[PDB]
Design a binder for this molecule. Structure first.
Ligand code: MN
Ligand code: MN
Ligand code: MN
Ligand code: MN
Lengths: 360, 360, 360, 360
């Protein structure tokens, strides 16, 4: 089996919020098997180097031509060839690898998790991001998600408002929920170390379980210092933009938890390299997401099932934010977790109608 | 346009406290344009290496003669020539650079902030130093400044009295003001690390937002340790006596905030080098002052407007302490900020009458 | 003056050894002034994250729309707005900044170097890369360049062949040329630290003046160790992919020389931030290039003229490799240097005919 | 005895190679005893923060008025009062302290060395700076100084010419002299670490005994690295601008030898603090000079005699460069050393005629 054609499709799907833009990869193999992948980001170029437009342009002009004609079954050789001719471009590489893994799983009749070694679980705990901006509305959304047993872990994106305001908001939510839920925050690099010093103390003293990426990745020593002084553990996300970054942060002791994202590492196999690094150092794990639809969510999930332990769960909620999908199989969210079937590949098939409907 | 003449005038102005001594620079260019600058310090030689007397002596004998005849429009070449023949002498260099930037802005019809790249704001938040020594009098002054909306951020100079006394004073002020104001302290290198250990803890636990230069610049490790243990962030001021010092402190992680002072770095362009260093490391900013009159205040301000972010505001209140000025344009303080116009140069002109009146 | 339109044109120019692809930016301002910039790389995605295709796609979809309507004269505000909405994308940002600086220089009648503060020199020393692969042919090319007084500094790209082979080649060239020329090498991250240990020793012992980027940027400690043990100084290039990286490498002591590249930092102003960082730490400078044509070469050059010192010269030879250009003014290479005129902006104008001829 | 009057006199003396400017201090005490001191520098502001003009201005306006009326016999109280009201200003402080020590020695009938604890030697080894610029001329001067037994240790100021040129020059001199003389160099901060790496190797491999201040004081890590890799020991000079700097460099391991200069530390007593710091760390000593005339030379010498060991000798040759002096007692240079008598104070008296003749 050889790689015959690779198509990168930009798709715009409506959300429950606006719209989320996905880049759907379709890799056609000579044996008739097709693999699907996804390379999605949030906000164009605001949360990463790659945009949907840049992703497609590079796949069409550089990445795809390098794979046409190669063995579809030798994923390692294929991905290494891409590393040789393309620096960075992890999101694009992630979609491509997901597609190849999908096709290979359909080919051998195995789920991607098994191709990756074997799953140790069939479901993953999912955290919900409360984003209404209104405290009361957030507490209500949280009590609802707990009632229908969909989520018991909650994440709050803070940092865009005055520090004191975000702190009042977060503390009130953890106060009202008590130990019924786990409350975590994500500052998305919005604070500088001077703001984080007091902020981390207040959050940790008020029952917040973890503070995700409080300060910018450019401030390495700041991360190392906060990792030593913050009452609540510090998790790295944006600081990891490659597997090599994870090693660096581990050797430095810059975070006690790593967020694992296939798009930021280069694919399901790459994210496993990062997880292995963290495991060798004693660093806790969390399954992250770039708000991908089902393809990317399942591609991530399949990799997370092989992990010995994910101390802090995952946030694979991307499909729940979309009102329309481009796959035929809707994800199974029940009892605070996401359930992954044992069907071949990613266990998904494209809805050609909706794909054509939402493709730009 | 060539530099024709440079005059350094020592001026003694009365304050609302005593008197403040300024060194006014007047640079005459062959195209008829004149630039004005200021090199001021506090207390002769008590807060720095340069005194008004030493500043004038060096400008007349060494610095000025090196510039006469050079292109007034090539500020870089001019300032680099001064670095080559004069070690240190940052205050004097600061006045000279401010004067050249002023003249160049009048020449091209641009405000100094635009010569420096472009402003991202038109006003700066100003902090007021409560200095009566009497707690009740300070709280009263603070409630007054809040009422007329002039200041909502306050700074207290402590360290000259027994530690416990200064702590009682500061805590009482923050207590009475509540979260209506931001209270910060400046110890002016008065404590040794042994005194600061408990002092910083008490201050941080009682709502003080930042502790400025608690210990001496000679104790580097002490700064690094306090930066790691103080509940309230540590800001460096006296430790920065050059741009290279800022790099050093950044690499060491000796403070999470840098005070930017044109006089301590060598001018508006130099202070920007320091700010860039701090930005590259994730270090927060604050616009400092050496209690300069309008010339030096505006020269500082014009540089601070180009900054992406000044997390902790500024303390450009120098003109408010003087009862008489030597410029014709009084500064605009309204709604807790200092407002900077878009007029050419520094946007100031000398009052020849008052200058002659207060010159010694 | 407002930014009215921005066009990103991919141009393919033939070289003396294939073709080089440039992305020409044309920024049209409401006052009728037009600025030109360039965002070029080598080998698609092999020497960086950005390809010509990705660069254009991002400019058309994200970067340009954010600037239309803003003041063309406030470059700082414009570039900071880009940092706020786009992570990375330094090559694209570089072309845009070069274009804005060009237009602003034509507008005020000043050369870009003066907009950047003022030049301290009018020409820059240029190094030539011997790339024939054949030792005898390289020595011949070097003796020729010396005869016509075009180059007296030479750089050799090594690392793609067995270590011993590359070493024999380099040592032979330095031997035949003697102290008539300066011989330097660039390994382009090709070696791992284990290979570099002996390689750096042999090179340093045989008169090679500097070893550029011997090992990969992922190996930080390796860089710090080689910086301490290599008999010949170590220069960082690929390790700097941002201004913040420069600070990091400086604080770490990972290289004694920094290669300055506008494309890797984000523009002429950004490259100056990096240079300032290195200067504050005592790190030597070298003017690098991404093999840009005249636009990018001049944009770089104009920034390097403001530098106090460039201990190791530059490699602004890009135009000499192209057989055809898209500008009307050919660069002046005479007496081992590149000469930069004092004309407004970049001092260049587009040849509409050739542009149309080579645009794809 | 009280301090009645202090006079700072700028004196211009002709040299054997121009003119050297001294600031002579005369402190008059109520008991009729007068003390003389000297605050001299090289090149105005090129080798330090203080110029003769700035030194006099600060003494007349700030330093002197703080001492009038105090006990002339309590030097500690007097010098500490100066530290309290004046930051830096070490050259000025040095002249004043030398004057007070002089007067106190005449008063008690003891040589300054005894006031400082007691001498362990009566003479100091003196090194000669070969400065003709011409290699042959330097070798000739060195063979002459050896013949008349005046100097057997030689220092070469390098760094202003291309590295290779300075290296050829130095190596030739050490080669021709052989082990008849000790050859050392002083780079006066002229090189950056990248240039020093190879330069220090060549110098150390060719018999140069020590390399003084190869790189700038701003590059701290560079000093620490060179201290570890240079085959010839590294001596710090400009890096010490205060006693606290010495501690810092010692704790860092930035140099294996410290140059002791009374002007850079604040006086004969201060220089002893620095020497004590180096001794406690195992750092070797060298008696430096700012090219002072006899007053400053003797003030330095008297302090160096109390030292347990000065591994690398001294460079107290200042008087030998002047054609005219302002004291009545010429210094005794015989048998490679400077001989210090056991007369009271500094053992010098002013020649009122020549003083009046050369005072400006
Ligand atoms: Mn995150
Ligand atoms: Mn302060
Ligand atoms: Mn390179
Ligand atoms: Mn020296």
């Amino acid at each position: 089996a050889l790689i015959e054609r690779i198509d990168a499709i930009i798709v715009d799907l409506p959300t429950i919020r606006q719209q989320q833009t996905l880049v759907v990869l379709r890799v056609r193999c000579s044996d008739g098997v097709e693999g699907i992948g996804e390379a999605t980001t949030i906000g164009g170029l605001a949360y990463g180097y790659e945009s949907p437009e840049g992703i497609k342009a590079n796949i069409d002009a550089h990445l795809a031509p390098a794979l046409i004609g190669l063995a579809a079954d030798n994923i390692n050789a294929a991905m290494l060839k891409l590393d040789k001719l393309a620096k960075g471009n992890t999101f694009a590489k992630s979609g491509i690898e997901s597609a190849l893994l999908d096709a290979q799983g359909k080919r051998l009749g195995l789920p991607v998790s098994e191709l990756l070694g074997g799953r140790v679980r069939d479901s993953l705990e999912v955290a919900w991001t409360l984003a209404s901006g209104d405290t009361a509305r957030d507490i209500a959304e949280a009590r609802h998600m707990l009632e229908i047993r969909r989520h018991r872990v909650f994440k709050l994106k803070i940092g865009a408002n005055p520090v004191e305001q975000d702190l009042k908001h977060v503390v009130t939510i953890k106060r009202e929920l008590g130990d019924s839920a786990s409350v975590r925050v994500d500052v998305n690099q919005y604070w500088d170390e001077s703001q984080a010093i007091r902020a981390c103390q207040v959050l940790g003293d008020n029952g917040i379980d973890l503070i995700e990426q409080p300060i910018s990745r450019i401030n390495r020593g700041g991360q190392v210092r906060l990792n030593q002084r913050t009452p609540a553990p510090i998790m790295a996300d944006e600081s990891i933009e490659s597997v090599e970054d994870a090693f660096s942060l581990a050797a430095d002791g810059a975070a006690s938890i790593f967020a694992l994202k296939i798009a930021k590492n280069g694919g399901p196999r790459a994210v496993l390299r990062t997880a292995q690094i963290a495991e060798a150092a004693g660093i806790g794990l969390y399954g992250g997401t770039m708000l991908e639809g089902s393809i990317g969510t399942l591609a991530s999930a399949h990799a997370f099932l092989t992990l010995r332990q994910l101390t802090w769960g995952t946030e694979l909620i991307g499909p729940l934010l979309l009102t329309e999908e481009i796959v035929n199989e809707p994800p199974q969210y029940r009892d605070f977790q996401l359930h992954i079937p044992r069907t071949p590949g990613l266990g998904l098939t494209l809805d050609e109608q909706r794909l054509a409907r939402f493709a730009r």
